[PDB]
Write a protein that holds these residues in place. Structure first.
Motif, mmCIF file in Angstrom:
data_model
loop_
_atom_site.group_PDB
_atom_site.id
_atom_site.type_symbol
_atom_site.label_atom_id
_atom_site.label_comp_id
_atom_site.label_asym_id
_atom_site.label_seq_id
_atom_site.Cartn_x
_atom_site.Cartn_y
_atom_site.Cartn_z
ATOM 1 N N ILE A 1 50.641 64.716 56.748
ATOM 2 C CA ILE A 1 50.369 63.407 56.159
ATOM 3 C C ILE A 1 49.026 62.927 56.700
ATOM 4 O O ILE A 1 48.904 62.586 57.878
ATOM 5 C CB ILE A 1 51.488 62.403 56.461
ATOM 6 C CG1 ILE A 1 52.831 62.929 55.952
ATOM 7 C CG2 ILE A 1 51.178 61.058 55.830
ATOM 8 C CD1 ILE A 1 53.891 63.012 57.022
ATOM 9 N N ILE B 1 45.696 60.394 56.564
ATOM 10 C CA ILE B 1 45.110 59.120 56.166
ATOM 11 C C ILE B 1 43.592 59.310 56.111
ATOM 12 O O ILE B 1 42.996 59.676 57.133
ATOM 13 C CB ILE B 1 45.486 57.983 57.126
ATOM 14 C CG1 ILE B 1 46.972 57.644 56.989
ATOM 15 C CG2 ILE B 1 44.637 56.752 56.842
ATOM 16 C CD1 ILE B 1 47.478 56.646 58.020
ATOM 17 N N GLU C 1 49.570 65.629 51.961
ATOM 18 C CA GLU C 1 49.823 64.331 51.339
ATOM 19 C C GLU C 1 48.831 63.331 51.911
ATOM 20 O O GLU C 1 48.844 63.075 53.119
ATOM 21 C CB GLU C 1 51.263 63.871 51.581
ATOM 22 N N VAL D 1 47.956 59.697 52.045
ATOM 23 C CA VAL D 1 48.391 58.324 51.818
ATOM 24 C C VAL D 1 47.439 57.375 52.530
ATOM 25 O O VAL D 1 46.488 57.810 53.191
ATOM 26 C CB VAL D 1 49.840 58.110 52.289
#
Ligand SMILES: O=C(O)c1cccc(O)c1O
Length: 518
Positions: free
Chosen positions: A480, A482, A513, A515
């Motif tokens: 994940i 950012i 991913e 996000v």
């Protein structure tokens, strides 16, 4: 001042604001470890401090041998503020070597017995240590020079390599003191100077160096003494590694020393040996981990010894099942005391007047009312009874590992809280309940992946600002990320970037991913 040089060498100090509070409030006192010992010899001179087989040290003898051994180290070239690695099993001479180093202001680097040369080599380099002191329970073990001959690279600056074989008498263990006249050895270290380096939990990789000052470590010991109920009549059994923070100070052999009690050293965890020492010396306290308590509770020898003197058993590691906790209480007929602590600082104890249920279900209360515990969600604090990332700062918690600036940027929050990697909650009585680890190891087709490892690399990507590597069942590795806003942050590009960096093929994410937050 020593601190000026220490900062340039990788020590992250307490911020000036927080340091003043800890002074003003009476947390930090003005004694180094060796000034503490001297005052213990002043108060408890002829009391027995340590027993190990047929060897024993009173407080007077501990202070004298330490002076003598410090004089010897000084004559050999050890200087104030030098780092010296200390590896030792549970032998009585380890207390002479620890305080011998403290007597000249040298700085121990505490190394677990059973750490290999691979661990020793990286610790020696990272600490810039000038010495390696290794104590051996017998003439068979590897000497300090045997371990150093195993290094992959030479370490020229680690020039002091001394071995001590623990023998049947203390005088025969330290023959090098025979040609040395004891010195008024005078170190200029202050209590707020760095006292030693500890090692972080080494289950996932090379241990990290943890700098503790005299004032903050002795403060933690003072508080542990109060909550464990130690007194000058306390006799404590030591079965955990002496070199470990738990055995050292929670409340540890230093807590017993602090009150003029007696430490009983066993090289062994074997049930029958420990039961015999408990009976022989009317031991009232012992610190354990769950695996040792299981071994004791299932020994068929349990009924063959008088364990009536046992009063309190500490169990630390925060991994104690309630069923075993209750078995400990009822089978040994003791007050259980759970301990959730870390070498990096914070320690939590259940209290002696706590209900048995609280001692079964929780790890108790922080040592200091100035200890700060944040249960973090994204970083935001959570209320009581909410499970989140346990973070902490306070009067004995480090503000950075030693000589590790890149890790430090990740292991501490922006406002300076230490990130423990553990998850849990604070219950209605303000007792901490640890429920697990923030990022467990991933089981990807046999291989065991450390999320923290893959996260470090992915953070070297220029446009990445934050990543969390998690596992999914199938187990696959997902990252994940950012972004700082970059279509170049995608699976193929991150994977090729990691391959180019030469990480283990089996540690590359199987899914990405991007996000905006977690
Ligand atoms: O490292 C630990 O697990 C630990 C446990 C209990 C108490 C401590 O001080 C510790 O360092």
């Amino acid at each position: 001042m020593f601190i000026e040089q220490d900062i340039q060498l990788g020590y992250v100090p307490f911020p000036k604001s927080r340091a003043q509070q800890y002074r003003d409030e009476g947390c930090w006192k003005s004694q180094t470890h060796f000034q503490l010992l001297a005052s213990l010899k002043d108060r408890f001179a002829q009391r027995v401090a340590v027993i190990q087989d047929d060897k024993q040290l009173t407080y007077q003898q501990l202070y004298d041998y330490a002076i003598h051994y410090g004089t010897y180290l000084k004559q050999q070239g050890i200087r104030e503020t030098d780092f010296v690695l200390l590896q030792s099993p549970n032998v009585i001479e380890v207390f002479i070597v620890i305080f011998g180093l403290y007597a000249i202001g040298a700085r121990p680097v505490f190394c677990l017995h059973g750490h290999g040369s691979y661990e020793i080599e990286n610790i020696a380099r990272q600490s810039r240590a000038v010495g390696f002191l290794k104590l051996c329970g017998s003439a068979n073990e590897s000497t300090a020079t045997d371990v150093c001959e195993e290094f992959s690279k030479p370490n020229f600056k680690l020039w002091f390599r001394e071995s001590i074989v623990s023998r049947s008498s203390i005088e025969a263990s330290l023959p090098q003191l025979q040609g040395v006249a004891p010195a008024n050895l005078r170190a200029q270290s202050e209590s707020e100077d760095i006292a030693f380096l500890q090692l972080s939990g080494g289950t996932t990789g090379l241990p990290k160096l943890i700098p503790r000052t005299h004032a903050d470590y002795i403060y933690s010991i003072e508080k542990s003494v109060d909550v464990a109920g130690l007194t000058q009549d306390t006799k404590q059994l030591v079965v955990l590694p002496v070199m470990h923070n738990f055995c050292m100070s929670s409340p540890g052999f230093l807590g017993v020393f602090y009150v003029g009690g007696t430490v009983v050293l066993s090289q062994l965890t074997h049930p029958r040996v420990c039961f015999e020492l408990i009976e022989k010396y009317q031991i009232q306290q012992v610190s354990l981990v769950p695996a040792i308590a299981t071994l004791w509770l299932n020994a068929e020898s349990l009924k063959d010894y008088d364990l009536s003197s046992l009063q309190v058993v500490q169990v630390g590691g925060a991994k104690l099942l309630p069923s075993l906790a209750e078995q400990i209480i009822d089978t040994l007929q003791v007050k259980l005391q759970q301990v959730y602590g870390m070498a990096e600082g914070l320690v939590n104890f259940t209290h002696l007047d706590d209900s048995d249920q609280i001692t079964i279900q929780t790890q108790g209360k922080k040592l200091s009312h100035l200890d700060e515990i944040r249960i973090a969600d994204d970083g935001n604090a959570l209320p009581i009874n909410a499970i989140g990332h346990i973070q902490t700062r306070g009067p004995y918690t480090i503000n950075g590992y030693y000589n590790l600036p890149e890790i430090n940027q990740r292991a501490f929050t922006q406002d300076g809280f230490y990130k423990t990697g553990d998850i849990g909650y604070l219950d209605e009585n303000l007792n901490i309940v640890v429920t697990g680890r923030e990022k467990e190891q991933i089981n990807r087709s046999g291989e065991k992946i450390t999320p923290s490892e893959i996260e470090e690399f992915i953070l070297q990507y220029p446009s990445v600002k934050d990543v969390c590597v998690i596992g999914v069942s199938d187990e696959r590795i997902k990252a994940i990320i950012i972004p700082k806003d970059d279509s170049e942050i995608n699976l193929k590009n991150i994977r090729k970037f990691l391959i180019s960096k030469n990480i283990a093929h089996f540690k590359i994410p199987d899914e990405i991913e991007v996000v905006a937050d977690f």
